[PDB]
Every structure is written in C-alpha cells, then in structure tokens.
C-alpha cells in the first residue's frame, strides 16, 4: 500500500482477495486527488457554494448561564442534507470520477447516509443504487422517499436479519463484480483501509473550521472537543486538526442505550472486544463465541456494532478519551437545546451535548472553554421523542 | 496437510481429478447434516469443503447465507462444528478435510489455538474466506505450526505477483480477466499447491473441463447446498439427491 | 407617522385607535434601531453565528444543460430553521428587547412562523404566545411538537373558521392590551405600517448578499430574480437591493393552485381586487360583497388571501412583474430540483423555481442569468408529494 | 345625524342619560332580529348600535364572533341587513340608529355609495371599527355628504391631540390609562360630540355611574348578546328576558 492500513493494531483490509484490487485503486486515487490542487479547487468550491461551508460557531451562553463553563457548537446541523456526512459524499463522488466511475454502491441503516449517496450522485451525474434492510426499510420510510426523489435505486435486502450489516454484504458481493465502474461509498470512518483515512480527510475541514473560529471568538484553542461516536466520522473530522495540539482534549460520546450494564448499548470501544469483521480489525459488539451483535441506541444512526480504528488506537495511547451517555441522557439534552437556545440537535449529536452538559453540571464552578459537534439536525427525530413525551 | 499430498498423488496414479464437494456444518441441522456428509463420501467425494456458521457470511452469496441461517436456527454453534468434525475424522480417516472460515471465528479466542483445534479434530486446511495474502502472515503461520493447510483463493483479476504469493503460501491446494491456462501453468510454474477450480463447478462438463484445462480437480460449492434447499421437505430424498449428484460429478473427472 | 405608510395607494394602518400607539412607538423604535449601529451588529452577529449567513449562492447547472440560461438559487433553505423566515424573526425579537419588552405574540397556518418565533424568543429570553387555528393545530403536529419543544405556548383558535384569520384576530385583541409589555411578531410583509417596512428590512440582506454574490460569480447583475409570494416577505428581501437597478426584472409568483380559472388559488394580486383587512389596503380574496375568502395552494405556506403593499404598488407602477404556477407546476419543479440537483425545496421555493423553469423552457435559445430565491427546503413537503405520487 | 342632536336634548330636558344597545342584525335570524330590536325600542332604548356580519369582526370580541357566526349560518348579507334597515326605521321614526362598520364593506362598491344607501334607508351614523382618525379622512367625508354621522372611538390610550382631533372630527356621539373625568371634561372642553360610554356596561349601576361621571349615557354592547346566545333555544324568553334587561338599564339612565 502507500499509506499505512494500520492505527496501531486497529485497521488493515479484511476483504476477500477479489475486492484488493478495488481498494489499491482507490488508495491511489486518494494519493493522486490530496496533491492535486484541482480536485481540492473542486471540492472546496462544492462544500462551498453547494454544502454552505464554512458552517457556524455557535456560542450557546443561555445553557452555560451561572456556571464557568463556555460552550460552543460547531454547526454541521446547518449543513446541506441536514447532517456532517454530506462533506465526505461528496469528496468520495469527486474520487469515483477521478476513477472514471459513473456509478456509487452503498448502503443504509438508519437513512442519513442514503440520502447524503442519493444526493451527491445526482449532483454529480453518477448512477446511485443503495442496498438497505427491508427491515429498516419498511422504518425510514421518508428517507426512502427522499433518496428515490433523488434519483437513487434503493434495493432492499433480505439476507437474514434484512438491516445494515446484511446490506454491507450485498453492497460489497455487488463491488467485486463491478468495481471497475462503480464505487464503493463508505458511510463512516470505518471498514478496510484507505476508508477510516479517507472519510477522516474529507471531514477534517469540521475541526480545521471549528479552530479557525475559536481562535478567532476566544484567541485561544478549546480545552476540549466533544463527538459522538457512531462509526467515527464526524468524531474523527472534528479531532483530527487537534491532535497535535496536545492541551486540547478529545472526547468521543459512544451511546449507553438503556445502560452499559444492560448489555443494550452500541458502546463496543469501550464495552465490546477486538474482532476482525468489516474488513477491519477493531472493538465489536460480540458474543463470546466470535458472533457479532447488534448495537442499540435510541438513535438509529449510532447503532455501529464496531467502531473506526483511529479512535481504537487514540484511545489506546491516551490521546482520546471516550465515554458514555444514555438514551435518557440525550433526550434531556435534546429538550435543554430546544428550549434554551432554539436548535432541535439530532439525537445523535445530542449524545456529545449531553455530555458537555455533564462535564459542566458536575463541576459548575470549574472554568473550561468547550466545543460539541452539533453533527445533524433533529426534525427527523421530533417524533420519536414525541413518543418518549 | 499430508492427506491432500496423498490424495493427489493417489488421484495422478489413477490419473484423474479431485471432484471436492461444499457444504454448511449444522445445514439444515446437526444430524441431517452428519448423514449428508457420510452420502457425499459415500458418493466418491475425494475432499470435503465444510463451513462454519458465521454472523454473516461476509464474503458469501445469498444461497450460503440461507444454508447459514438454517444452521443457526437449528442452534448450530462452532463449538457444535468442532465436535461434527471430530466424529467425521473418526469415521472417515483419510478423506482430507478444508474449513471455510471468517477471521472473526479464527481471531476469537485466539488465532493459534484455533488451528490448535483444528488439528486436534482432524481437519487439514482453513481457508479464511476474508483475509488476502496481505494480512495472512499469523493465520499462515498458525496453520503450519498445527499442520494444516493455509488455503488461498487466486481470483480472476489476479497478477503475477498474487500468483507467486499464493504460490509460496498455500498448502494442501490453490482455491482457482485472465486466461485459465494462463493462471493454471503459471501456477504449476511457481510450484503452487494444487489448483482445483472452484468457479462454477455444477454439471459434470464443468468438472471434466476444469480437468482438462489442467487443474487438479474442481470445488462445486454452491450446487450442494441447492439439493438440500430443494429438498429440505423431504431429508431421505434430498440424501438420494445428493447421491446422484457427486456420483456423476466425480464419474466426470475419471479420465 | 415618521416614514410613508403607504407604497402609493396601497399600505395604511387600518388598525382599530386603541392599536395606533402600539404601531407609532414600533415605528419609532424601528427607526432608532436602524440608525443604531449596536443594533445593526447584534442583529448581524446574530444571523451570521447563528442563522448561518450568508447562504450559499449555488449554479445548477444540469438543470439547465442544453439551453442557454444560467441559472443560480438563493439558498434560504441553509438558513437556520430551514426558510428565510428566521432572518426578521430575529431582528423582531431584538426589536422588542429594544423596546424593554419580555413577552411576544404571534399566530400561524402552515406552522413554519410559529416555529420561527419559538426559536427566535427562545434564544432571547423572550415569553412567546403563539395563536394557531385549531384546523391548522392538528394538521401541522409537527411544527406544533417544534414550538413546544422550544417553549412557545401554542394557543389554538376556534373562533369560526378557527384558522389563520381567527388566529390573527386573537393575537391583535391580545396585542391591544398587552403591547405595553409583549410584542406582535407579524410573519409577514404586510398587514399595518410598519410592518410591510420592517419586514423588508430585515429580509433585504438576501438581495444584497445575492447581489455581491453573483457579482462575484458572473460579474454582472442578474437579467431576473424571481421569487413565491404568499404575503411577501421572502420576495421583497430579494427585490429590495435591486428596485434601483432597473435593468433587473423583479418576478413575483403568486399560487395558481388548481388553477386560476378555477377559482381555486391564492392569486390575489393579479386576480382579486383591493379590499381593507388585514389592517391595510391591499388586494384580495374577497366575494363581491366584500367578504375576504380563503386563498388555496398545495403549499399552505402560499394560502394568504391577500399580499404585501410593496408589492400591490411595485406591480402598478411597471417595476415588478407577478405570475401564476400551478400545484401541477410547483410538483413539477419539486420533482426536478431533488433529481437534478440534490436539492429537496419547499413547494413554496417550488413555485418560484417553476416560474424559470418555463422562461427557461419556453425560449431554450435564450440567454439568460436568472436567480430564483429559493425560501426553504422541502422535507417538510416529502409527505404531501409522496400522497399525490 | 339630527336624530341624535334632538335625542341628546330631549335626554336634557328629562335630565336622563342615554341607553344604547348593540346587537348583531341577523342575528340568530333575520326574523327574530327585527323582533328582538324592536323589543329593545319598547323596552325603552334611546338608540341602537348595529352590527353588520362580516367575514371575521377583525376588531371584535368571540360573543360578537360567535353573534356573526350565527349570522352567517342563517345567510345574513350586508344586502339584508339594509332591508331590516329600511324596515326598522319604516316603523320607528326618531330613534338614532348607528351602524357598527368594519371599513372593506364600506369600501367595497365605493365609500360614498356606501354612506349613500345608509342615508336612503334612514341610518344615522356609521362607526368603522378598523378606521382611526388617521385614516378616516375619505370615510368622515363621505359620512358628511350623506347627513351620517361619523362616530370614533376615543379609547383610554388616548391623548391630548387625539381628543382634539376626535372632537372635530366625530358627530351625533363619541365612542367612550386615563382619569374618567379627564377624558369626558376634556371632551365637553374642545366640543366633542356627546360622550357614551360604552366599556363593560353590563348593570344598571353601571348606567347610573357612567351617567354621574358626566357621560351622556351608555353603550351596552355584549351583554344584549350574552340574554341572546343563553336564550337561543326559547325565542320567546329570549324576547322576554332582553326586555327586562333593556328596562333596568334604562331606568337606571333615568335621574
Ligand atoms: C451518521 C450520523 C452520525 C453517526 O456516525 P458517525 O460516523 O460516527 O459520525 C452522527 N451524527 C449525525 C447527525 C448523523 O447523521
Ligand atoms: C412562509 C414561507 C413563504 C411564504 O411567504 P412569504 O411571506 O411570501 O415570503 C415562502 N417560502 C417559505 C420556504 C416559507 O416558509
Ligand atoms: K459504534
Ligand atoms: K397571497
């Protein structure tokens, strides 16, 4: 390869000999488009005039009032698409024409990652087929409406269990037979190398961004940075420009569900074990015979049963720290942001806030300058919290 | 490992190929599945292909997936694999005998003591269906350590650099864009462990072709567990079946 | 009064006495604020870190591949809250805080002016009341859940109609006694002087970041800015900066529903006839009695009876040109955008984008630089286009 | 217009103030309309303040919307309601009658032709609720032209320019933060057409008081609505129970 598959012990390509072939190609595609001062002109002028990049900073003091804590939150909620994972999408469409390619493969669970394929294809002129679980299918009705709006060809699969892992694998059968014209859209910062690395690099303008402002706000960096941690993307993009700035702290919310010791959580970073499953060797939710299990969260878009490889190895050597928060937890979070600053976050994203929300609640009168990755908007979650309430 | 030396040698004497059935440990259940076996051998099967259970069979095609899932339901677990493979070693001593596996199942409780198993069972190859020759270093030399048979798949788009890889890695046998002969005698060139073509292998022409072309034999996967998908209504003709189908398939690769 | 109510013959306070001191002291207040340059930065501030301005001036290029018009969108559906609606909310809400105020009152149909006053007050610190019909209540649960949740009290009507009208008439009566304390949030460009001007002026920053905008990109003035009017607002915002430039055409699209031979739209401009109500004189839906009707449109955010002022006098005087777009034509457009662009508008923006669509169509061979003002995103609008196809 | 100048003087002469009632005309009926007002003329009322249906009393209160609504059901018209006009005033001669106007029904088919038919079916005065002095200019005018006096509401936000303003421009009567006595002696001050009082004029206390602070009587708006909308199911009572009521806030004008 010519960049290292590895995080440590974390990462590598697991993927039958058929499917190398695709992933040297792309890797080398990757290499070709970083030093390539067009492809980045292109990308840049489509996050900008497209996505609505640079997103906002937004200083939230009525949640902070009568505490020494100051918060912010960077706003990928008013990114085109409703969340993060439109920077990534369309950098990796940008790759699938560099290719050649005309057509994109993928795959969805709880739909954002659907859409953000659907839309970028059809900007772009590529022909989108998306491979989902019939049972979230039959779920996430209106993102299924959504990407076939868009043109998308939403396929449902039925293989087993008929969710997110089953449709991994039909994307992926799909891929080794039609990689020379079709590509591979990776939703998260996961699965075999150069994705984790790829999907970090077109989502790493979130904390490139996010320092630009606090520097410019505050004249200093934050003393910490706060994400969820579904797959690892918008974690990853938001850290990655601070890794080196050590004095800065970098803290990724994993979902607690109904609570660790419940076994119901989607944590497996730090409550799962090694495993070598998509494509990847990396922290997995798994029975103790090797079987993988399924990951729950009242937010279906953290219910990875893995984790990407970056953050395995930033947490092994002390440079990440991760934590959890419940289902509970981030509804509170959710309703405090609603009525006190007039922004619905999306339940993935209210995870990191909820968490912020503790650091700050805990020790109220301890002074810190935090950051929290609003990831995504919440108006697709105004009803599953009006079941809850 | 040497069981494969001697079945290959013993095939050459006799001079035709190896006609290698597939098959899922515990499809459509422990018992069904023991007699299924024991009517492949009976039929002439020189090897036997077995795969373990698996989350989700990463790497496999729908027809597997649904053998996989007829496993499960019927409660079928690795550790249950590893004692229906004991009992075929016990019956059948020089049958040579490949696994099918994901690295999650190998990985598990440790790499060298899975092969550790496997050679305490009686098993003489794995095959670990996602892991390429760039990440086989520990399975490999796991595999040797116990003596058994580090089986790699040469794909289609495979180069010459692949082709010596496997070449030197593999043992017990070579899981066969480019021209067949092209592949098979480069194969043979950089003394790779036997070819035997896996692609497509369900009707007796396919078997005395792939014979032909050179390989060492032919894997029929997928065409086994159809018999049984058919006929799982009725488990005494789906033995019948399956009778019927090795038999002419091995007939097709006597020369 | 200390600015011109009126816009020729159209505009006024026909307001009841007890209501005048409330208009006068707003008007005053408004006239303070706009010469106030603390105003101005606050307010700034305020759409920039936290609206997310200014928003992405996008080309679409494969919508209009093949003919010779060039064709940009505002892109008021980044806006914070998903439609320009929140630009004046804020000024308003910082309006009534100018004003020592703490309370603020509104009503709404649609829902979308109830959510952007909740959040608006919500970030404020503001106490907001907001009227809703009770037809509209259990129509719009959504956007009813939405003000909830950022703390507005939802009051429904069920006066007659118990609709926006009978909400509008609660809200005033409210106003009448309370004025002294809490401030009317009208949501849109009309209804009593100072209204319609104030409106404007809190909108206006779309035509002139337009104006930088495609200055910037083309290096000229576009040959056309079309946008939907309901009562206005979106549409003035983007006229306002270019009324001086004459060579712009200033195209205003008003609902033709089922169609206007049918009776069935919400055309009143164009097809209706000057009435009072409302507190102004503008044209309407009315009987030949006099009694004001009911505007249709496919879009509710399009069903107010009558229009702005500014724009019932821009049209008399030659300046601005309104048309009419179909349901059929708005579903056409929405269908459009999201397969050719990636982009789901709202079927309000739909109309707008229509309009162009067939100046584009009609005269393929025409070169042209159109800007349509694209007011807000569709999800909200997935439901109603999945129900009709 | 003169109608009023004479029942303001012969009010003087028996030193009593005025009762006026308002009530919705079509209201629950065109029927039971014309009897209802004319069971306030003989119960004793000095004048009537009527109200013209329209599509939503953009100044009015939810009795008086609830009033309408019940208008509407029954196809009430402004068209009809000039009939009953033309007909209560056949029957009664010299009892003042104001017309309680929102200003797009006035506007409708033109300001003047609307002052005109109010001056053909024998109407006194014409209050456009929605109209302030600020924009009453083409509305007072045209009252003017027509003999129709053109009624304001002096509300109690009201100030020094407004009161002058109101008391120039206003005939037959004005519609009544600040001291009682201050508006009504600031009134008399600049000339101001005799003051009502019509805020919640709901007893004969009321009356009386209204009478003592120097206002030439009242306005009881609602309240005839309320004996109204309670009685709707027995027309008969309803009569009978309006008549009562008008006589007891009547006698309490009565000094
Ligand atoms: C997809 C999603 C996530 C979860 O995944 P990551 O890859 O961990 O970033 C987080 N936030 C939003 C709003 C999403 O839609
Ligand atoms: C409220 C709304 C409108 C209609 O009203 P205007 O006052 O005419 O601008 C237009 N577009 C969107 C997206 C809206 O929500
Ligand atoms: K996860
Ligand atoms: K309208």
């Given at each position: 390869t010519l960049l290292n598959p590895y995080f440590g012990e974390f990462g590598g390509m697991y993927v039958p000999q058929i499917l190398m072939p695709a992933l040297n190609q792309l890797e080398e595609a990757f290499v070709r488009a970083q030093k390539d001062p067009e492809f980045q002109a292109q990308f840049a002028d489509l996050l900008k005039?497209?996505?609505?990049?640079?997103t906002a900073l937004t200083k939230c003091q009525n949640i902070t009032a009568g505490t020494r804590t100051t918060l912010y939150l960077k706003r990928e909620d008013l990114l085109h698409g409703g969340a993060h994972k439109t920077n990534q999408v369309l950098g990796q469409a940008l790759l699938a024409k560099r290719m050649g390619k005309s057509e994109i493969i993928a795959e969805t669970g709880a739909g954002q990652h659907g859409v953000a394929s659907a839309l970028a294809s059809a900007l772009l002129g590529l022909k989108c087929r998306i491979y989902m679980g019939a049972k979230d299918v039959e779920r996430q009705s209106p993102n299924v409406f959504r990407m076939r709006l868009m043109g998308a060809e939403v396929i449902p699969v039925?293989?087993?269990?008929?969710?997110l892992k089953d449709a991994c694998n039909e994307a992926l059968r799909d891929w080794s037979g039609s990689y020379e014209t079709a590509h591979y859209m990776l939703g998260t910062a996961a699965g075999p190398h150069p994705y984790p690395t790829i999907v970090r690099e077109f989502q790493r303008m979130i904390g490139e961004e996010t320092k630009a402002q606090i520097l410019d706000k505050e004249g200093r960096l934050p003393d910490a940075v706060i994400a969820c941690v579904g797959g690892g993307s918008n974690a990853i993009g938001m850290f990655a420009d601070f890794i080196n700035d050590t004095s800065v702290g970098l803290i990724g919310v994993e979902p607690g569900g109904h609570g660790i010791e419940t076994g119901?959580?989607?944590?497996?970073?730090?409550?799962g074990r090694v495993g070598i499953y998509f494509g990847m060797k990396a922290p997995m939710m798994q029975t103790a015979d090797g079987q993988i299990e399924e990951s729950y969260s009242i937010?279906?878009?953290?219910?990875?049963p893995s984790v990407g490889p970056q953050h395995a190895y930033l947490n092994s050597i002390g440079r990440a720290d991760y934590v959890s928060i419940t289902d509970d937890e981030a509804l509170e979070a959710f309703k405090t942001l609603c009525r006190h600053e007039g922004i619905i976050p999306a339940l993935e994203s209210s995870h990191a806030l909820a968490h912020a929300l503790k650091m700050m609640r805990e020790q109220p009168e301890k002074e810190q300058l935090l950051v929290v990755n609003l990831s995504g908007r919440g108006d697709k979650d105004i009803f599953t919290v009006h079941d809850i309430l | 490992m040497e069981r494969y030396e001697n079945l290959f040698a013993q095939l050459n004497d006799r001079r035709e190929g190896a006609f290698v059935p597939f098959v899922t440990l515990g499809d459509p259940g422990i018992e069904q599945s023991l007699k299924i076996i024991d009517t492949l051998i009976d039929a002439g099967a020189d090897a036997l292909e077995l795969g373990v259970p698996f989350?989700?069979?990463?790497?496999?095609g729908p027809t597997i997936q649904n053998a996989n899932l007829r496993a499960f339901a019927a409660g079928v677990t690795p550790a249950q694999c590893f004692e229906m493979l004991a009992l075929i070693r016990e019956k059948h001593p020089t049958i040579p005998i490949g696994l099918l596996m994901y690295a999650n199942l190998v990985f598990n409780n440790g790499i060298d003591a899975f092969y550790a198993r496997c050679e305490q069972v009686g098993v003489d190859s794995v095959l670990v269906a996602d892991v390429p020759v760039e990440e086989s270093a520990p399975f490999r030399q796991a595999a040797l350590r116990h003596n058994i048979a580090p089986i790699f798949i040469c794909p289609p788009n495979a180069d010459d650099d692949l082709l010596r890889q496997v070449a030197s890695y593999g043992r017990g046998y070579t899981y066969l864009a480019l021209p067949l002969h092209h592949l098979i005698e480069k194969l043979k060139e950089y003394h790779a462990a036997p070819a035997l073509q896996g692609f497509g292998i369900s009707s007796p022409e396919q078997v005395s072709a792939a014979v032909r072309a050179g390989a060492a034999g032919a894997i029929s996967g997928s065409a086994i567990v159809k018999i049984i998908e058919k006929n799982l209504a009725s488990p005494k003709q789906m033995l019948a079946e399956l009778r019927s189908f090795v038999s002419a398939m091995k007939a097709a690769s006597r020369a």
């Open positions: 005039n497209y996505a609505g990049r640079p039925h293989s087993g269990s008929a969710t119901e959580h989607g944590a497996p970073l730090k409550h937010s279906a878009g953290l219910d990875f | 989350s989700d069979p990463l790497a496999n």
